[PDB]
Structure formats: structure tokens, C-alpha cells
Amino acid sequence: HHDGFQTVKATIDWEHPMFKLYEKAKRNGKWNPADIDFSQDQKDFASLTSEEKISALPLVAGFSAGEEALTLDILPMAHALARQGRLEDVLFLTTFMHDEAKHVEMFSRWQQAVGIGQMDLSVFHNDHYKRIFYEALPEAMNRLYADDSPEAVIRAATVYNMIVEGTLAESGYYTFRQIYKKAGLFPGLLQGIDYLNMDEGRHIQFGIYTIQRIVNEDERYYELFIRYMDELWPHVIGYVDYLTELGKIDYDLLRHYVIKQFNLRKKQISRT
Amino acid sequence: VHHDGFQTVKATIDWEHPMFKLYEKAKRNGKWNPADIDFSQDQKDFASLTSEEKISALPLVAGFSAGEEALTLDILPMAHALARQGRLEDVLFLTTFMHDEAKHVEMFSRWQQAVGIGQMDLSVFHNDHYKRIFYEALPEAMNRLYADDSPEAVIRAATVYNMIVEGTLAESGYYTFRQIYKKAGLFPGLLQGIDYLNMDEGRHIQFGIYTIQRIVNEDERYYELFIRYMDELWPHVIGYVDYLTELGKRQQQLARTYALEIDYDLLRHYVIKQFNLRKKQISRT
Ligand SMILES: CCCCCCCCCCCCCCCC(=O)O
Ligand SMILES: CCCCCCCCCCCCCCCC(=O)O
Ligand SMILES: [Fe+3]
Ligand SMILES: [Fe+3]
Ligand SMILES: [Mn+2]
Ligand SMILES: [Mn+2]
Ligand SMILES: [Mn+3]
Ligand SMILES: [Mn+3]
């Protein structure tokens, strides 16, 4: 049952950080994947040899599954914060969920346009990738339906926002730019990446806000965060190594960048 | 719970799915931002009103504000249950649905803040019938879906949420706002909001129609479940409407001041009409 309603007893908390982030999401989130012109991507793709075509698909396969998992798996976070009465968080999360839906749409439109919609790209998900996206991520978010304790929320935000978004996604945007932007290939896709990268800045800020406000309550939670981060690193790097190994471009630069993101996300949370 | 795979890796979005097409319309038609609405004239209007006229408008606003908030929170179980069923295109659309309702919450709250009543507790205008619908039956029907996503459960959730709350009460609220405040020329920023809300609502009701019908299409038995759940909530729909009416009939000074003949019998009949029209938008097959 509802005991009452915040915007009937009072108003929105206009100064709340997540209301501010919601306002910025509406302002900066107007893009529409249906407006991206993929015609040249299609031509670029067909101009590749079979072997070059294949080299492109692992990274797209990681992203398409990623965007789909994140669209589905943010719902428990929204439910748990809703149940906690965190109205402004929920408003923001409506823009978060809608962003990920557009991200799903973007990669699928690209697949459709370049002619691989009918191909099953699951073959490029190795065991490490499945451990994160098929298993650890949904386990950690679905937990929130029955256990919204500080520890559960931090673990959910660590896997979703600091690992998948803050570490793999950010590294994937950089990777696309280092490989295809220099080659002049897939300009529609890279336009998409630009929009996704901009959305991701807000998504990561929500993860930081969430984790830090729980840490501020008890610095014992800081240790949990670092522990959950380190528990996932071997699959992050197991996946990265798998991708790198297929690519054989400075692949060792890209691998540094993953490490640099991982440590950056740890340093964005304050012990105190 | 594991993911077994992902549609957009094995295949693509179903580009021709009705809910993907509704999703596309939502993105095209749903750009409006409540932060862009100018309420400065509304603030002047409200302050020019006497105390009796000031409170004349508030029962309706109280009903909407809680409605918007309830609907923002309570659509999340429907999105979960369709996501668990693998209905990706429905989920895409529901992201636009939930964002619309968030903007609806924001719109009414901005208006309350702007006119100077954000600090007033408007729960006093929720009678017993309203609470039966919005504080109880609605969250019960939606929350059920976390442990019972059966056709019977999904039909009941869509009925309460899309056909009763949206299709009957919200639609009749939009109409009432226009018959009264648009006629009198008051609260232009609010009415701009109401028109955006009304446009959004069309999609929300169409999702409800799609959902109920696709279930009825699998077994006609469910059509009579739909009708019975509609009739079960009617006494609360009309009990709330009568409450608003009785309030409206005893606070006549706004109508007098602004030269309006508020036909409350006409408004009642619009609500009855909406209830029966929503019933008729569902067929046995
Ligand atoms: C080859 C160098 C390794 C670079 C790392 C690339 C990882 C690919 C990204 C796949 C997961 C993307 C998750 C989506 C996040 C979101 O939608 O917010
Ligand atoms: C005086 C005549 C009464 C007419 C009926 C008035 C009904 C008031 C509406 C309040 C409930 C609105 C629910 C919001 C629904 C939504 O956000 O989709
Ligand atoms: Fe994201
Ligand atoms: Fe609605
Ligand atoms: Mn390994
Ligand atoms: Mn009664
Ligand atoms: Mn994304
Ligand atoms: Mn609404």
C-alpha cells in the first residue's frame, strides 16, 4: 500500500542531487537512434573482407548484450529506491532506463543496417563475459527485491555502474574510437557511441552518488566496495584478454585504458 | 536469476512489433519538458483568487498529483514481469511510459510550488473511495506481478492501471480541467501541462489495450474477467467523482466570479461514458 504521497503532502526536493541529474538528463538526452544514418556503415561493412567483418563483431556482441542486460537489470534498483521513498532517485532512474533502451536500439539498428541481424553473435561471449553479464549482474540486481540492505545496494551499484559502465563501457567507447574512427569506418555507429558516452556520464554519477551516500553512513562499507570491485576484476580482464587475443592497432594501449578506468572508479569513492 | 541469452545478440529487435512502434511514437511525441512551462501567470491568477476560490481547484490537483506519483512507482512491477517474459519491445516502450509519468509528477509539483501551495498537505481531498483505488487496489494489483505473472494477474493489473485510473479517471480529469479552468481562462501553464499529459495518456491507454487484448486473444474466458474487474472498481470511481462533485457544488464562488455554468451532471456523464468506452475497446478476439 501507499501510506501517502510526497507531491501531495509537499513537493519534489528540488535541490536533491538526483533531481538535478534528472533535469540534466532531460536536457541532454534528446537524441534518437532512429535519426542516425547507417547507410555508409552498411557500405563500409560490405567493403571489408570476411576476415575484417569478423574482427568487428566481438565488440558489438559485447555491447548489444550489455545494453540489453542493463535495460532489464536496472528495474530492481528502481523498485528498491522507490520502496525507500527516494522519489528523486526514481525520477532520474526513468531517464537511466530510457537511455539504456535507446542504447539497445542503437546497436540493433546498426546490426540490421550492415546486414548481420540474422547472425547469432553469442559465439563471442566467453565464460568470463557470461560470468559478469549472464550471471553476476542479474544476481546482484534481483537481490534487491528481497534484500535492499546497504550492503546489497552497494554491491548492485558496484557491479552495474562502476564495473559494467564505469570500466567496460567506457573502455569500449575508447576502443571503438581508437580503431574505427582513425580508420574512417562506421560513422553512424561512432555517432551512436558519442551519444552513449554522454549518457554514461550521468549513469556513472548515479552509481557514485549511491555508493558514496551509503559509505558516508559507515566507512566499513568502503571496504565492501573495494572488495566487490576486486572480486570482479579477473572476469573484466579475462574478457579483455579474450577480445585482445582475437584482434591478432595498439592493443596494449587499450588494455592499459581498462586498468586506468578500473582504478579511476575506485578513486571516485571516498573512504570518508 | 540468470539471463539465458539476449535477443539483440541472437537476432534483432522485432521492428514491426506494435509496442516497438508505440515506443517510436513516444520518442517522437514525448519531448516536452515540465521545466519549460511558464507558470508565472498561474501564480498571479492563484493570488488574485479569494480563499474560497483558491481551494476550489485544489481537490482536482490533489487527485492528479497522487495519481501521477502512484503511477510512476507502480508501473515498475509490470515492466519487470514483461521483461521476465522476454517481451523486450514492451520493455522498451515501458521505459518511455515510466518517464512520462515522472514528468507528470514533476509538472503538477512545479505548479503547486509556483502558485504557493507546495507546503499545504493536499491529502485532505482524498476520500475513502480515492484511497481504495490509489493507496490500495492499484499497488496491490501491480505488486502481485512479482510473484504471479499469470494472465489473470496481468489482465487485472492493466485493468486497474490503464483502463480505470488512466482510461476513466485521468481522461475525465483532463476534460474537467478544460470545461472549468480553460473556459474561465485561468492557469495557462497548468493547462499546457494538461494537454501534454493528455497526449502522453493516449499511448498509456494503448499499451493497456494491447496487453489486455493479447491475453483475451488466447482465451475468451479472460474477456469476462476484464469486464468483472472493471465493474468491481466502478463504485470507487463514481464514489470519488461524487465526492469531487459535492465539493464543487458547495464552493460556487469561482464559477460565479468567472461567469461559468459548471455542468456537474455533464461531467458525471462523461465519466460513465469513458468507463463504458474503455470496456468497449476490448473484444472477445
Ligand atoms: C579490446 C580492449 C578491451 C576494451 C573493453 C571492451 C568491452 C566491451 C563492452 C561490453 C559491455 C558494455 C556494457 C554496456 C553498458 C551500458 O549500456 O551502460
Ligand atoms: C468533478 C468531476 C470529476 C471528474 C473526474 C476527476 C478525476 C480526477 C483525476 C485524478 C486521478 C488521475 C490519475 C493520473 C493518471 C496518469 O498519470 O496516467
Ligand atoms: Fe549506462
Ligand atoms: Fe498515464
Ligand atoms: Mn579464463
Ligand atoms: Mn461512499
Ligand atoms: Mn548503455
Ligand atoms: Mn500520468
Author numbering:
A (entry chain B): 3 to 250, 263 to 286
B (entry chain A): 2 to 286
Sentences copied from the publication:
The heterodinuclear Mn/Fe cofactor is found in the R2 subunits of subclass Ic ribonucleotide reductases (denoted as R2c) as well as a related group of proteins known as R2-like ligand-binding oxidases (R2lox). Although the physiological function of R2lox proteins is not known, the cofactor catalyzes formation of a tyrosine–valine ether cross-link in the protein scaffold.
More mass spectrometry samples were consequently prepared in the dark. The Y162-I72 cross-linked peptide was obtained by digestion of aerobically Mn/Fe-reconstituted V72I-R2lox, but only if the samples were processed in the dark, whereas the cross-link was not present in V72L-R2lox. The Mn/Fe cofactor can thus oxidize the tertiary carbon of a valine or isoleucine, but not that of a leucine, indicating that the carbon atom has to be in the correct relative position to the metal center to be oxidized. Moreover, only a tertiary beta-carbon of residue 72 is oxidized by R2lox, as the tertiary gamma-carbon of a leucine in position 72 is not.
